[PDB]
Design a protein around this nucleic acid. Structure first.
Ligand code: ZN
Lengths: 45, 52, 116, 94, 71, 121, 125, 35
RNA sequence: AAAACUUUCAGCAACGGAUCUCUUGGCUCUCGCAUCGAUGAAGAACGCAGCGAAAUGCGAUACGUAAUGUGAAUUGCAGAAGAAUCAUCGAAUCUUUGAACGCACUGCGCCUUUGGGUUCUACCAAAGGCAUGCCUGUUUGAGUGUCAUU
RNA sequence: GCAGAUCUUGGUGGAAGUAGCAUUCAAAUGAGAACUUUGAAGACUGAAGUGGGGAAAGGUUCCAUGUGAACAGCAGUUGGACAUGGGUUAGUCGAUCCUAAGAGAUAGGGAAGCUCCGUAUGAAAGGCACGAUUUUUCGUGCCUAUCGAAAGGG
RNA sequence: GUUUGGGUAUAGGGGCGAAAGACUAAUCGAACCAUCUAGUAGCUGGUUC
RNA sequence: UUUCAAUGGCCCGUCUUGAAACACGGACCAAGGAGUCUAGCAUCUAUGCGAGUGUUUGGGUGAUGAAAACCCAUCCGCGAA
RNA sequence: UUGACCUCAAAUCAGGUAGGACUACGCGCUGAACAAUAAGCGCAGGAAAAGAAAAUAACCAUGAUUCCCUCAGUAACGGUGAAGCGGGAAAAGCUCAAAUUUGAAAUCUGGCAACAUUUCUUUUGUUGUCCGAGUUGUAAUUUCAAGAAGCUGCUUUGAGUGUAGACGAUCGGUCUAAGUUCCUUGGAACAGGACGUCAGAGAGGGUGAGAACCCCGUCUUUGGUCGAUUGGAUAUGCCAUAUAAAGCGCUUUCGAAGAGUCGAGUUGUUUGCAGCUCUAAAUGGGUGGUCAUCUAAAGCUAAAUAUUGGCGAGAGACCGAUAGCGAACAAGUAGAGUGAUCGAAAGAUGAAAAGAACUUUGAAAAGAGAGUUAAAUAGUACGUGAAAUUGCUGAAAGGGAAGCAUUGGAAAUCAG
């Protein structure tokens, strides 16, 4: 959106929509063995 | 600002012809070409005239 | 109200192209018609000679050009002007005669019915 | 800036662009074929007429003309017949 | 309410009692307009709507308003 | 979908039965959209709508070409079959009558037309 | 220098025309050079990019990569080449767009139209 | 009120439905605005 | 008279949005051309996309149809595979309004033709018509208007 | 080229955290309960209601579900908020029809003119029947706008 | 201890004059809007290294 | 640079008056913000020419931006009584 | 009785046509306060209007209109303020009324019918036929510059319809030279260096940083090629109602010329024009100075000229987000008002969204590790990030002001 107020407003609606749905799945879910934080050391060649 | 500001300037046709004559004569002076900023340090002759 | 002149070089060019457009059409004949020589009407300018509007009926008749064919070959006619002296007559009669000598008139395609 | 110009600025329909303006382009010769074959499109019509042997105007010229190089009693005449005029150039002769 | 929606211009400027629009002068045949109202003119003049037909005409002019079909 | 050239190679009542069939298919597809459909059906809606438009276009042009044939070489033809350039152009003098001249002016241009000439320098 | 009054040298107009171009115009804008071998074989210096063409990335961080064009993204002036991707945080791969001028066409997806286009541009096939 | 012209029902519905959240996918297609 | 507090200075972090650079905008000048509408304009309203609110486009054939050109896209996702949210554009479509035209401003009429139905002297639907002034012609008239008719 | 114009626009201070703005118990729900919900107790309007309906007016504001960004001179699990969907069914009820005071086009007449006066006015102001068909060219007789009431008439 | 809802019509200054008429106004008393207008300044305030 | 010591130091602008003081403006910062363009006249200086002087109404001409530059027919302005 | 005609009606009669909008420029009308102004009203076009002398002049005369320069701040009028001449731009001229075709209404609309034609099945005609219009006058002929009618002997001539090719114009598609070699820096080479290439192209734009050689272009092009539609000529074919029509030149013959208009009186507006009363003439009438000049009361007319609008184009010693249009972005939008009207604020992540997976804390919003990136001192409250102002830490000062100046001390820190 070339209009700065509108692109900001849509982002805030997008951010709320994303955060709400991320925790909708998070509360539904509540894994540790598989999902581990990847770091630079783990990504070292 | 107005568009009828004076943009063009009158000059007597004699003074314009004077300045053009003075400009050509200055072009034939090697020292003025160097001060002008021309790299004519190896030009065979000033004024430089080539064939037709 | 201020009238500016920023279109002065533009007006100059547009008039040149109008002459070029006119010549593009009428290509061999001149872009201007031949004007007569008249003497300006006052004691301050009567010693001069300037261009008139057209040639008088008496001038054309002495030059052998009919008032109907004059316009066809580019000779304007001034039905209002008259020749009060023979000097005006001779000045413009010879102007027409010189113009005729330098003129090349191209023939025209005519209709010719088969019978009489 | 007009409402009618802002209308098509925000529009999706393309502008009706026409490309017709090329200054310095002199009108091409139709009319006479002999004049067309000998007309050089660069020159002016005064230069072209003089080169061809024709008079652009039969009247005085209202200004200075270009100099490119350093140039080196009723009855008798009312009755006289002007003996035509010479054809200077080839095109006039043609 | 002293004004209602005007049938012509669609603005809520149609005076009920006078039965006349204060904006466009409806139902007079001509539209209300004033030279002292320069901003009022630009608010409703040509270009403020669609100009659907004028855009067609402007587009048709270049070819000389030709009709028919291509070869 | 429906190709316009093979559509134009058919008769008007055949084009009508195809249009009726397509309108039924469109109605069924919009019923599927309200009941919960797949992307294929939702994409089929637009194609069917364009196919209806193509059939209607072919029917209308065939109808109008018949009207043009019926009115060919007639003094008066339907307004929608007449030219539509602008209102002003329709009111203008035709090139014929804009070129009408009196016999007086015809004789003038017959006997004294503008001549072709040139001036020798 | 440009001498035509039909072409504008204005930066404002040129950038508006570039970023306002329709897809048919961006199709010309998204052109790539032909490789040396293709150039001496077809007598054509450059061609518009078309899907399934075989190209080699010449410039950028992916200098040297090769692959087919999986999509020409005309609305962004981008070429998505197979296997030239970027690994997001979550593990999905986002294809990396390359400007058409930064690749070189090593093999063309020849059709009847492309052959007609080739011979049209003073070429040979 | 209640005895309302049908044009009013269309007029009221369109005015209200303008006040509606702009879709998420709408933003994803570059740009779309309010008002 | 230590701390707090107040002030000063420096550092960091805030608050704010100046500066700098930029710029599909504006403004000014010049040049070319002449094209709205009863064949319904300008304007207004309402609608239309697989997922759309504005803007854009379009009008129930509704982000378009035909035709011609280009030649393989669209793109946010899904989906599809002479493509296209492409260009050009000579064929069309073009709801309700508006000079706005049967009369009114949710409505109420008249005329012509055709059609439907599980019911046919009824009911229903469809299509095409019905404004004003003036002109030319046509037809039908009126007049204790001017006459002719053994 | 600004220190000032009770300068313009924006930003931010001190004043200043200042001026200020008839319920009780247990339970349930909730991360959270002075404000929600249920039960008990105590009270308030007392048919002139804080009751129950409509007109005009608003326009979805009705209902259900979700959320607790902005609202809330406090707050909320909360609002007439936000989001998502749903909801108004008529031969008999209203409009539709009629007229009212009045308005108003038409006929005409003014007016340089936008327009004004005028409403049966010095308007050719619209019908009905009859007939063996009448020189197969119609004779005879009779009678002579619209808008304005969702409270009037039906 | 006759008001009122909805719809409506419409004259609207002042003196002069017995009246009629006038003599200037008016759109009544006014209000609001937009242009004219950048009305009229011997004045106030400010006027930049 | 901060701070201390000793010494000195009345708030800036505006206005009024012989002069003050009043009085008016000033919470703070940033950005903006006021002798400009044009026509006429006059002086002085410079420049070109000089009993002359002034090309740019207009015409010619200008291929490399042609709104420039370059050229000047007839007039006319002022001066020379 | 029958029938002519006049006048006046009617029809959803056949076929047309008017309105409204735009309105920069143009022509009328109306018109103030302080200006043939603004506002108001009417009507146009691509230009409009004006226009072929009831014009100037006083000359050796000029010669429609318009426009520019000059005349000229002159004459006049009492500050207002011309015009003739002169120089230029562009140039083009004309049609009626008034005449007996009178040996012939010779003229025209419409219906129907064929036949062609087309920007076009959309356009435009032709031929025939019939009904009408028209003698209360339609053609031909004439317009004062003349002219008619006779006469004469010279010079003249198409309102056809094809084809061909050339020359122009408009539209649309198409054609176009040369590095992406080497090294360094960088996330990216378009930077620096090296070696080269093209240039009738070293304009501009794009591409991950300054790109003539990567791309679009640019130049060639003041053209090739392909169509499409046109324009005026040229050559040529066919047709041609010429028993015709013209120009010139001659006269023992003729020569019509516009009325409630001019004008006079008087009242308004500013001599022109309007009202009112009165109301002409025929070498008459108008206008200038006996003379000159012109010929009103009917009409058309290209170009030079104007153009804040319309459809486009090219530029700039212009503005650079408080500027430039009110509006660089949802801009006449949100919003306000019963209404006429009023009317903003608001541009910048990055090369790429790669827009932060995953773990943990929290009810959640978020936080913290982590991750992407050249960079998060780029996290959408996103380029740079000033000051006012605020919190924090450090240092110091402080008994009812503070700022400041001077001189040094102390502490800290610089040249050194
Ligand atoms: Zn209205």
């Amino acid at each position: 959106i070339k209009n700065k107020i509108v692109r900001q407003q849509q982002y805030m609606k997008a951010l709320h929509q994303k955060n709400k749905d991320k925790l909708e799945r998070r509360k539904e879910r509540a894994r540790l063995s598989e999902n581990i934080p990847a770091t630079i050391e783990s990504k070292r060649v | 600002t107005k568009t009828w500001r004076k943009w063009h300037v009158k000059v007597n046709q004699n003074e314009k012809r004077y300045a053009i004559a003075s400009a050509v004569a200055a072009s034939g002076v090697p020292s003025l070409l160097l001060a002008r900023g021309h790299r004519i340090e190896e030009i065979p002759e000033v004024p430089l005239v080539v064939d037709d | 109200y201020v009238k500016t002149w920023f279109n002065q070089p533009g007006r100059k060019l547009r008039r040149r192209q109008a002459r070029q457009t006119k010549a593009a059409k009428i290509a061999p004949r001149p872009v201007e018609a031949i004007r007569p020589a008249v003497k300006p009407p006052t004691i301050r300018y009567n010693m001069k000679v300037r261009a008139g509007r057209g040639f008088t009926l008496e001038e054309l008749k002495a030059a052998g050009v009919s008032r109907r064919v004059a316009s066809t070959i580019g000779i304007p006619v001034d039905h209002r002007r008259r020749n009060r002296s023979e000097e005006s007559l001779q000045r413009n009669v010879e102007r027409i005669k010189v113009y005729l000598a330098h003129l090349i008139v191209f023939p025209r395609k005519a209709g010719q019915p088969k019978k009489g | 800036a007009n409402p009618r110009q802002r209308n098509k600025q925000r529009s999706g329909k393309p502008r009706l662009t026409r490309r017709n303006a090329n200054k310095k382009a002199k009108a091409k010769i139709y009319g006479n074929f002999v004049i067309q074959q000998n007309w050089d499109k660069h020159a002016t019509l005064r230069q072209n007429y003089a080169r061809l042997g024709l008079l652009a105007t039969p009247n005085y010229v209202t200004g200075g003309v270009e100099k490119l190089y350093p140039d080196p009693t009723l009855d008798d005449v009312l009755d006289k017949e002007i003996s035509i005029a010479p054809a200077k150039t080839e095109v006039v002769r043609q | 309410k002293s004004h209602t929606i005007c049938r012509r211009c669609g603005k809520r400027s149609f005076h009920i009692q006078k039965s006349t629009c204060a904006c466009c002068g409806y139902p007079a045949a001509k539209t209300r307009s004033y030279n002292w109202g320069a901003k009022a003119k630009r608010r409703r003049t040509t270009g403020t709507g669609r100009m659907s037909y004028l855009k067609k005409v402007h587009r048709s002019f270049k070819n000389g308003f030709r009709s028919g079909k291509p070869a | 979908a429906l190709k316009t050239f093979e559509l134009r190679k058919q008769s008007q009542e055949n084009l009508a039965e195809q249009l009726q069939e397509l309108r039924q298919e469109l109605a069924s597809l919009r019923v599927q959209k309200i009941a919960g459909g797949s992307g294929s059906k939702l994409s089929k809606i637009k194609t069917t709508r364009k196919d209806i438009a193509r059939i209607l276009t072919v029917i209308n042009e065939s109808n109008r070409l018949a009207a043009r044939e019926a009115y060919k070489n007639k003094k008066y033809i339907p307004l929608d079959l007449r030219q539509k350039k602008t209102r002003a152009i329709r009111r203008a003098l035709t090139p014929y009558e804009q070129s009408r001249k009196t016999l007086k002016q015809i004789k003038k241009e017959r006997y004294f037309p503008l001549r072709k000439y040139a001036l020798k320098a | 220098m440009k001498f035509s009054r039909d072409v504008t040298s204005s930066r404002r107009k040129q950038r508006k025309a570039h970023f306002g171009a329709p897809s048919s115009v961006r199709r010309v804008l998204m052109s790539a050079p032909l490789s040396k071998e293709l150039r001496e074989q077809y007598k054509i210096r450059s061609l518009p990019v078309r899907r399934d063409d075989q190209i080699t990335v010449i410039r950028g961080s992916n200098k040297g990569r090769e692959g087919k064009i999986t999509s020409v993204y005309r609305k962004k002036f981008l070429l998505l080449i197979e296997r030239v991707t970027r690994e997001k945080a979550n593990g999905a791969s986002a294809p990396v767009g390359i400007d058409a001028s930064k690749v070189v066409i090593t093999k063309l997806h020849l059709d009847k139209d492309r052959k007609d286009l080739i011979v049209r541009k003073g070429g040979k096939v | 009120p209640s005895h309302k012209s049908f044009r009013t029902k269309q007029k009221l519905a369109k005015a209200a439905r303008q006040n509606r959240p702009i879709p998420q996918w709408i933003r994803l297609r570059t740009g779309n605005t309010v008002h």
